[PDB]
Design an enzyme around this catalytic site. Structure first.
Site, mmCIF file in Angstrom:
data_model
loop_
_atom_site.group_PDB
_atom_site.id
_atom_site.type_symbol
_atom_site.label_atom_id
_atom_site.label_comp_id
_atom_site.label_asym_id
_atom_site.label_seq_id
_atom_site.Cartn_x
_atom_site.Cartn_y
_atom_site.Cartn_z
ATOM 1 N N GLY A 101 0.918 -1.157 0.035
ATOM 2 C CA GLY A 101 -0.131 0.035 -0.160
ATOM 3 C C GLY A 101 0.971 1.298 0.007
ATOM 4 N N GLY A 129 1.221 4.431 3.080
ATOM 5 C CA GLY A 129 1.877 4.103 4.464
ATOM 6 C C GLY A 129 1.708 5.713 4.850
ATOM 7 C CD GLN A 130 0.531 7.583 10.291
ATOM 8 O OE1 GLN A 130 0.469 8.840 10.382
ATOM 9 N NE2 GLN A 130 0.766 6.955 11.636
ATOM 10 C CG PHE A 131 5.343 9.029 8.453
ATOM 11 C CD1 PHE A 131 4.769 10.187 8.328
ATOM 12 C CD2 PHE A 131 5.508 8.070 9.298
ATOM 13 C CE1 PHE A 131 3.829 10.177 9.619
ATOM 14 C CE2 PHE A 131 4.728 8.250 10.309
ATOM 15 C CZ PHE A 131 4.169 9.579 10.666
ATOM 16 N N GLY A 132 5.331 7.277 3.734
ATOM 17 C CA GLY A 132 5.820 6.415 2.582
ATOM 18 C C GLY A 132 5.149 5.459 2.259
ATOM 19 C CB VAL A 176 3.963 -0.808 3.461
ATOM 20 C CG1 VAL A 176 4.592 -2.167 4.119
ATOM 21 C CG2 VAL A 176 3.575 0.173 4.453
ATOM 22 C CE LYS A 199 5.685 4.336 7.572
ATOM 23 N NZ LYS A 199 4.406 4.545 8.595
ATOM 24 C CG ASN A 213 -5.589 1.851 12.844
ATOM 25 O OD1 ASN A 213 -5.023 2.233 11.827
ATOM 26 N ND2 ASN A 213 -6.266 2.849 13.553
ATOM 27 C CG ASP A 257 -2.102 4.033 15.214
ATOM 28 O OD1 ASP A 257 -2.581 4.664 14.257
ATOM 29 O OD2 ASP A 257 -1.633 4.893 16.125
HETATM 30 C C1 LIG Z 1 6.138 -2.168 7.584
HETATM 31 C C2 LIG Z 1 5.298 -1.403 8.459
HETATM 32 C C3 LIG Z 1 5.624 -0.082 9.218
HETATM 33 C C4 LIG Z 1 4.515 0.474 9.942
HETATM 34 C C5 LIG Z 1 3.313 0.210 10.199
HETATM 35 C C6 LIG Z 1 2.278 1.078 10.654
HETATM 36 N N1 LIG Z 1 2.699 1.400 12.198
HETATM 37 C C7 LIG Z 1 2.052 0.778 13.380
HETATM 38 O O1 LIG Z 1 1.222 -0.113 13.179
HETATM 39 N N2 LIG Z 1 2.525 1.518 14.497
HETATM 40 C C8 LIG Z 1 1.897 1.333 15.608
HETATM 41 C C9 LIG Z 1 1.807 2.445 16.546
HETATM 42 C C10 LIG Z 1 1.098 2.370 17.680
HETATM 43 C C11 LIG Z 1 0.493 1.286 18.090
HETATM 44 C C12 LIG Z 1 0.424 0.239 17.200
HETATM 45 F F1 LIG Z 1 -0.130 -0.859 17.502
HETATM 46 C C13 LIG Z 1 1.091 0.210 16.117
HETATM 47 C C14 LIG Z 1 3.039 -0.912 9.442
HETATM 48 C C15 LIG Z 1 3.724 -1.685 8.538
HETATM 49 N N3 LIG Z 1 3.419 -3.038 7.949
HETATM 50 C C16 LIG Z 1 2.322 -3.037 7.084
HETATM 51 O O2 LIG Z 1 1.985 -2.220 6.732
HETATM 52 C C17 LIG Z 1 1.933 -4.433 6.684
HETATM 53 C C18 LIG Z 1 2.384 -5.588 7.182
HETATM 54 N N4 LIG Z 1 1.553 -6.467 6.558
HETATM 55 C C19 LIG Z 1 0.928 -5.829 5.642
HETATM 56 C C20 LIG Z 1 0.033 -6.485 4.571
HETATM 57 C C21 LIG Z 1 -0.841 -5.587 3.791
HETATM 58 C C22 LIG Z 1 -0.866 -4.321 3.868
HETATM 59 C C23 LIG Z 1 0.326 -3.917 5.031
HETATM 60 N N5 LIG Z 1 0.910 -4.585 5.693
#
Ligand SMILES: Cc1ccc(CNC(=O)Nc2cccc(F)c2)cc1NC(=O)c1cnc2ccccn12
Length: 278
Positions: free
Chosen positions: A14, A16-19, A21, A36, A138, A151
């Site tokens: 997808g 993502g928040q700052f760029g 994934v 990410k 989330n 998140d």
């Molecule tokens: C790689 C990556 C980096 C940052 C995040 C989002 N950061 C959080 O969840 N922070 C957070 C903060 C506070 C509490 C909490 F609980 C959490 C997520 C991902 N990984 C994906 O986005 C991912 C993984 N598998 C799939 C499959 C389909 C699509 C996306 N992904």
């Protein structure tokens, strides 16, 4: 720490928040991870954000929380490494499924999905970590219907209608927020309980309708004012079809006006793992 040359970028999962994934391979070959990467036009503010998110996520070490297994920060571009959740977003995953007659999902599985959220939320509570944005959107699904709470922030245009936006205010997932968050900006564990209640309604709704969907933003905000007033004019989420009364009663307690009368996540787990089976 961790070796950046060990990552093999395979697809875009997808934004993502700052760029973006990326799904990545680690030869250590298809040991799959999500990566990410800090966007290449990313402002000094987004980098700071990215680095903070790194620090927040390093704290979170549970089967039902997203795990930072690794980081590539010590050199540009900045990178975050998490488990890969193959079924992606829980709201989109559930949206496809239909309740088992008498892709499908059964009622005991909907309980199992909820209990995994109750467990991960129980873990956060022991850290006195306040999520502030618990919702199915989330959550990530990795199979065998394994749920990781994550998140993704509040900026993705898919879930735009989930947030209340005022120019120069905090973005507010109001349809999930406890009355006291709406009126005072007070996020606690008890308001995380309230949002879990709404998340639990979402799961039982198979994510097919927005909480208070037929009510406007304003109306949700004034419903919070009806909770403060305590005149019996507060309106609740209705019982989902897939939801029994015993379980619905537990959703209601989650939305008790008094924070301390909302059930701790330990009791929400005990209910969903044990009591909801009988
Ligand atoms: C790689 C990556 C980096 C940052 C995040 C989002 N950061 C959080 O969840 N922070 C957070 C903060 C506070 C509490 C909490 F609980 C959490 C997520 C991902 N990984 C994906 O986005 C991912 C993984 N598998 C799939 C499959 C389909 C699509 C996306 N992904």
């Amino acid at each position: 720490d961790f070796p950046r040359s060990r990552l093999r970028f395979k697809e875009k999962l997808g934004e993502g928040q700052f760029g973006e994934v990326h799904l990545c391979e680690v030869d250590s070959h298809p040991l799959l991870v999500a990566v990410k990467i800090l966007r290449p036009d990313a402002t000094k503010n987004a980098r700071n954000d990215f680095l903070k998110e790194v620090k927040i996520m390093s704290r979170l070490k549970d089967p039902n929380i997203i795990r930072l297994l690794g980081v590539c920060v010590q050199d540009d571009p900045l990178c975050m490494i998490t488990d890969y959740m193959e079924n992606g977003d829980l709201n989109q995953f559930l949206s496809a499924h239909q309740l088992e007659d008498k892709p499908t999902i059964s009622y005991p599985m909907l309980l199992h999905v909820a209990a995994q959220i109750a467990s991960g939320m129980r873990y956060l509570a022991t850290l006195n970590f306040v999520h502030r944005d618990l919702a199915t959107r989330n959550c990530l699904v990795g199979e065998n219907f394994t749920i990781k709470i994550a998140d993704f922030g509040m900026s993705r245009n898919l879930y735009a209608g989930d947030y209340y936006r005022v120019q120069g205010r905090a973005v507010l997932p109001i349809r999930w927020m406890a009355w006291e968050c709406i009126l005072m900006g007070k996020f606690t564990t008890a308001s995380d309980v309230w949002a879990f209640g709404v998340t639990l309604w979402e799961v039982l709704m198979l994510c097919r309708a927005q909480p208070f969907g037929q009510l406007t933003d304003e109306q949700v905000i004034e419903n919070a004012g009806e909770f403060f007033r305590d005149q019996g004019r507060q309106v609740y989420l209705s019982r989902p079809p897939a939801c029994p009364q015993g379980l619905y009663e537990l959703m209601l307690r989650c939305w008790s006006r008094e924070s301390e009368q909302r059930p701790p996540f330990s009791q929400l787990h005990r209910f969903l793992a044990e009591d909801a089976l009988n």
